[PDB]
Design a protein around this ligand. Structure first.
Ligand SMILES: *O[C@H]1[C@H](O)[C@@H](N)[C@@H](O[C@H]2[C@H](O[C@@H]3O[C@H](CO)[C@@H](O[C@H]4O[C@@H](CN)[C@@H](O)[C@H](O)[C@H]4N)[C@H]3O)[C@@H](O)[C@H](N)C[C@@H]2N)O[C@@H]1CO
Ligand SMILES: NC[C@@H]1O[C@H](O[C@H]2[C@@H](O)[C@H](O[C@@H]3[C@@H](O)[C@H](N)C[C@H](N)[C@H]3O[C@H]3O[C@H](CO)[C@@H](O)[C@H](O)[C@H]3N)O[C@@H]2CO)[C@H](N)[C@@H](O)[C@@H]1O
Ligand SMILES: NC[C@@H]1O[C@H](O[C@H]2[C@@H](O)[C@H](O[C@@H]3[C@@H](O)[C@H](N)C[C@H](N)[C@H]3O[C@H]3O[C@H](CO)[C@@H](O)[C@H](O)[C@H]3N)O[C@@H]2CO)[C@H](N)[C@@H](O)[C@@H]1O
Ligand SMILES: NC[C@@H]1O[C@H](O[C@H]2[C@@H](O)[C@H](O[C@@H]3[C@@H](O)[C@H](N)C[C@H](N)[C@H]3O[C@H]3O[C@H](CO)[C@@H](O)[C@H](O)[C@H]3N)O[C@@H]2CO)[C@H](N)[C@@H](O)[C@@H]1O
Ligand SMILES: [Mg+2]
Ligand SMILES: [Mg+2]
Ligand SMILES: [Mg+2]
Ligand SMILES: [Mg+2]
Ligand SMILES: [Mg+2]
Ligand SMILES: [Mg+2]
Ligand SMILES: [Mg+2]
Ligand SMILES: [Mg+2]
Lengths: 142, 129, 142, 73
RNA sequence: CACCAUGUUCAA
RNA sequence: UGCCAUUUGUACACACCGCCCGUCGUUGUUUCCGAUGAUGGUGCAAUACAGGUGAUCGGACGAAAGUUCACCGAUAUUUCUUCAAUAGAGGAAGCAAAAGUCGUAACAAGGUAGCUGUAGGUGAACCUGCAGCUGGAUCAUUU
RNA sequence: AUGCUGUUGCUGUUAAAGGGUUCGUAGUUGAACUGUGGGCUGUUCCCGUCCAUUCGGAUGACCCUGCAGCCCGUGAACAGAAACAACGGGAGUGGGGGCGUCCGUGAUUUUUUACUGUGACUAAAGAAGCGUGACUAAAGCAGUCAUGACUGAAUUAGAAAGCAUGGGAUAACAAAGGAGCAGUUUUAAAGGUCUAUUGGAGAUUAUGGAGCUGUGCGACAAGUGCUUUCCCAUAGGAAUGAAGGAGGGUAGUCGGGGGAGAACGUACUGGGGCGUCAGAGGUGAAAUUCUUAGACCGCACCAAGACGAACUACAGCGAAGGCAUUCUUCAAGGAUACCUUCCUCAAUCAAGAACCAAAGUGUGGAGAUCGAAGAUGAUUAGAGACCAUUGUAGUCCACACUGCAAACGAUGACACCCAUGAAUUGGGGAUCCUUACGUAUCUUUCUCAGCACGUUUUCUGUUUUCACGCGAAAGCUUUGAGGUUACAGUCUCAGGGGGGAGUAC
């Protein structure tokens, strides 16, 4: 009950497939422009921003902590986002009005497990790497 | 309505052979469906068959001898070049040892093995093994 | 009637294999053409001529006695109907439904069956215009 | 081609109907090209007539071909 | 056939 | 009040001391509507019109300056169209967060069987009317 | 990786998903048939004549593709019929008749396309790889060897379309629709029409070649008998077939199918007419409510509006919604029967059409009963609910509108194959793989050569407990969810983790 044969039925099969590829959430995201115009990074990776304020986001059930994260405002398009600060400590390396280099983390913008509504991640603060500051490879300028 | 008479005939042979019958009654018949059966006689997959004359399209009574596993029809009759026989053998046949792909060529209705030897190509009709 | 409706009914006449007059009838092929052409001058259409010869004269299958068919005998003699017999009885049915529906304004079922006979009329008249049994301007009444 | 319309003065539009094979879906596809063809008064082709056209210079904005033989009906 | 509503968060 | 077996239903499984629905509060987020505000380009065609090209005259010293007309046309300004972005009092919807409030709608005949459509009512789950369905709690009882 | 985009190759009863039903265009798909030939030569039983009596006996079977020549259907010949498909300005200075080529030009009646086999053309770099110890390798095209030698840089795939050519299965385009139709030669005669030679060239000019038509005449055919056929005592017979595909017809029909008229049936209410007297109602208990100005009850009747109980069911009709008294009517519908007619007219469908339960809307009617809203009782912690009493819109009809269902079989349409045993509805028919065989019951002075039944066939419809097979299972199973990794009959619609959300624009 599914599809058509016929030696001259190729226009039917070409039209049939081009509409059913829009139902694929990978094909539709790769071929519509709401994907990049609403992505806070401009269809790119690692956008810079300025730290505005520090937030403690409480973990989801069944976990219980508060996740240390900053809210930053990106430079390329002035979009306010909340981004996580990975490691033990590490808001001690971030002050307000710091330029931070913010990547996503994990899952193509889908909020890695415990943290609710945070889908970006601090990589580098004041143009020195944030994991290099944790392991004390080098220290902050100024 | 009935569209392909050859696809009808091979489907009633294959159905009655998996039921282990001794005879089938094939209706309607054609010149094509008797030339398909005579390929299946020459490599001994069926026995003697008999065409009953109506002044309509005929009927065929085919004697089965237990050797046929599956006969089927490829619809639409795809065009097959001489370089394309090894592609059709891997797709519809169970092995390269046995099994035949029947083609309608300019030289006639033949299996794939004869058509490879006479260096011809055709449209594919069906298979039997 | 399979084309419109759900009927899978299989009731037909099954013509004999032995296409030969039965040798007990001594009527000439010449006289059967006179009887066929005479009945058309009494207003009988070709389907009604053949039953009267089948029932009373013993002529099953006028084609076997006289090598040509009844309507072919009529076309040679100039006695063919103006429009074909199939199209006659469908038009004559469709006008008897409409003369019903003018006084019976809410006969809901006969308005549905009238769509179906006119769909048969426009689908036969396309056949007869293509095969040139009917003029190109023909165009059913309603 | 086959004659499609003869409504213009001394010019016909021919229709070239061909099957376009798709390599992915192993199936053909009916396409067509229409060409305006200058038709000489040596010829009177009706619609549906099959003609043979030969390429020439531009004779108008769209006319590049010119009818050489008409095969009736 | 009167009425009969509810029991915090993880975990074992 | 409890216990044991069989049958049946279940969205229960640390198992009815279960599970679970909506309004309401608190926090955070992304949309939409909205008087009004406003931005960057297109297209449309309207005038004005820099320059030049061709022509016509011109003829200082053949041939410069300059006339005049036609054409190509930049730019300027306005008129709507159209695409992409954007501020907004107010009004909402949704989602997400450790244990706030109100009931208890659903799951068992969940204590009025559930549910579909529609219409009206209500803090809120929802109730009610009418015609359907069993995915029902009946495959069954003038032989 | 992902048969999680499925052409190969996915799902759609319940997991997301078949669209409410029909008609229907574009589209895609579409039944059979006109045929591939032949000859020669190779390559021991059992059936009977004597014994015995519900059981024995001595006494006609079977066994030994390969090469050549075909008027290559059969006619008809022993080149004629059948079937076939003129330029020297030419050719390396033109290779007395025949033969046969080459080149170019005229006159004569027509078959393509897809497919398929071979070719012809198609830049390197890149890919594939042939040589070679740049020390290996990634490379590169180089180098290798005993007053210079063999030099190498081979080859192949490269989308479609374009070009040439041969093969003719399958399909395709086109045309036809068959009364709409397409007699060959010998011979001499009549009339009449607009180039080559005579040395050239010019101008006149009759003859003649070959063709034009109206005849007579000599042969041979004819796919339809003219020694006929009609009158009376004038070409008309040559056409595949009739699809267990569609259409139409004719016939007794069959059904809660539809429309329209009348007429019935009890019942719920409401009335008066007759009587009664003390409560009825309602509930789990009550209370709102009715009642000595007479309720409830009982009897007959009347009015009005709905509705057709039991019979009424794994029954029928209809495309689906849906349809249940009767009688008179109108147009239909399917099935069945048929040696009627037709001859591919079909299948399925974007767009487009017409129907579509209930609620709802508009305008008129109607207004009995039930009754969203609302009002009173009660239950309750609360009760905006269930329960009781009411009661508006609605229910019902007419004409418009809407088009929102668990519109279900949670199952698209059309074909095909498919094991078994009870039944049921309508129609019809009988009473070494076998050359055939069985018939009862009871009603019967007029919709009566009747009705029902019994046994058996068979077609169409709605199903049931039962073989494969299938499925994750529940379950499905000629009524598929079977015939599916052994995956292609045709067309079509939808789905792609849960939501947001059937929301916003
Ligand atoms: O059309 C039928 C078909 O041809 C045939 N195969 C048959 O199959 C059965 C048959 O089954 C039915 O049994 C029914 C009786 O209970 C009978 O129906 C018939 O009943 C008679 C009496 N009223 C007839 O008058 C009636 O017309 C008829 N319908 C059969 O149809 C069995 O009886 C046989 N024993 C076996 C057959 N295979 O069924 C088809 C229709 O169902
Ligand atoms: N979810 C984030 C994932 O990260 C990936 O990002 C990168 C890495 O996480 C990942 O690195 C993997 C490493 O994790 C894993 N342990 C081994 C693997 N060999 C690495 O792969 C990488 O390193 C090798 C070198 O050997 C490179 O040759 C290779 O091209 C590169 N993919 O390879 C990716 C190339 O940088 C994918 N880019 C991204 O699509 C995916 O979603
Ligand atoms: N730009 C329009 C603005 O919308 C505002 O409206 C805000 C609210 O009315 C509205 O309420 C949202 C609501 O959508 C959603 N359903 C729930 C959410 N908690 C609310 O959010 C709002 O209220 C909470 C306080 O409890 C704040 O913490 C939160 O930041 C604020 N956005 O969301 C809007 C912002 O997201 C105000 N009316 C006003 O500032 C202005 O109209
Ligand atoms: N979040 C969107 C919607 O919120 C609604 O429900 C939301 C709230 O109404 C609901 O509130 C619950 C409530 O059920 C229950 N009675 C008490 C509970 N504390 C509340 O919880 C809420 O509030 C607390 C903070 O106060 C949060 O930590 C918690 O995550 C949040 N669930 O929690 C939900 C928030 O996730 C709809 N029920 C639901 O359909 C949907 O999830
Ligand atoms: Mg509570
Ligand atoms: Mg509880
Ligand atoms: Mg010559
Ligand atoms: Mg027929
Ligand atoms: Mg009364
Ligand atoms: Mg009374
Ligand atoms: Mg109560
Ligand atoms: Mg009431």
């Amino acid at each position: 009950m599914t599809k058509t044969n016929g030696q001259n039925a190729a226009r039917k099969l070409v039209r049939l497939r081009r509409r059913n590829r829009w139902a694929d959430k990978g094909w539709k995201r790769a071929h519509t422009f709401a994907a990049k115009k609403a992505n806070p990074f401009g269809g790119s990776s690692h956008a810079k921003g300025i730290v505005l304020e520090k937030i403690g986001v409480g973990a989801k059930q069944p976990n219980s902590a508060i996740r240390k994260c900053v809210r930053v405002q990106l430079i390329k398009n002035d979009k306010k986002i909340i981004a996580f600060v990975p490691n033990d400590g590490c808001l001690h390396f971030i002050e307000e009005n710091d330029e931070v280099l913010v990547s996503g983390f994990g899952r193509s913008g889908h909020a890695v497990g415990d943290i609710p509504g945070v889908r970006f991640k601090i990589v580098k603060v004041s143009s020195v790497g944030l994991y290099a500051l944790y392991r004390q490879k080098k220290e902050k300028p100024r | 309505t009935m569209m392909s008479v050859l696809a009808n005939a091979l489907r009633t042979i294959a159905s009655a052979e998996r039921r282990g019958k001794r005879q089938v009654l094939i209706r309607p018949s054609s010149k094509v469906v008797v030339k398909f059966l005579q390929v299946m006689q020459k490599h001994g997959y069926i026995g003697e068959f008999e065409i009953i004359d109506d002044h309509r399209a005929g009927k065929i009574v085919v004697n089965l001898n237990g050797r046929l596993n599956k006969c089927g029809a490829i619809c639409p009759r795809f065009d097959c070049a001489t370089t394309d026989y090894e592609k059709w053998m891997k797709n519809i046949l169970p092995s390269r040892q046995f099994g035949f792909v029947v083609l309608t060529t300019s030289l006639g209705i033949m299996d794939h093995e004869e058509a490879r030897s006479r260096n011809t190509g055709g449209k594919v009709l069906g298979f039997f093994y | 009637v399979r084309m419109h409706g759900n009927g899978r009914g299989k009731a037909s006449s099954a013509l004999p294999y032995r296409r030969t007059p039965p040798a007990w009838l001594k009527i000439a092929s010449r006289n059967v053409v006179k009887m066929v052409c005479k009945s058309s001058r009494k207003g009988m259409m070709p389907s009604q001529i053949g039953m009267e010869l089948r029932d009373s004269m013993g002529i099953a299958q006028v084609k076997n006695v006289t090598g040509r068919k009844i309507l072919r005998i009529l076309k040679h003699s100039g006695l063919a109907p103006e429009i074909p017999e199939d199209l006659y009885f469908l038009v004559k049915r469709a006008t008897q439904m409409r003369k019903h529906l003018e006084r019976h304004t809410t006969d809901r079922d006969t308005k549905y069956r009238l769509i179906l006979v006119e769909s048969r009329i426009h689908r036969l008249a396309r056949y007869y215009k293509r095969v040139k049994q009917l003029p190109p301007t023909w165009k059913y009444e309603s | 081609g086959i004659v499609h319309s003869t409504k213009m003065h001394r010019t016909i539009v021919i229709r070239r109907n061909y099957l376009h094979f798709i390599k992915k879906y192993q199936r053909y596809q009916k396409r067509h090209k229409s060409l305006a063809v200058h038709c000489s008064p040596a010829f009177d082709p009706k619609q549906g007539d099959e003609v043979v056209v030969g390429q020439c210079r531009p004779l108008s904005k769209t006319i590049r071909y010119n009818v050489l033989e008409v095969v009736s009906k």
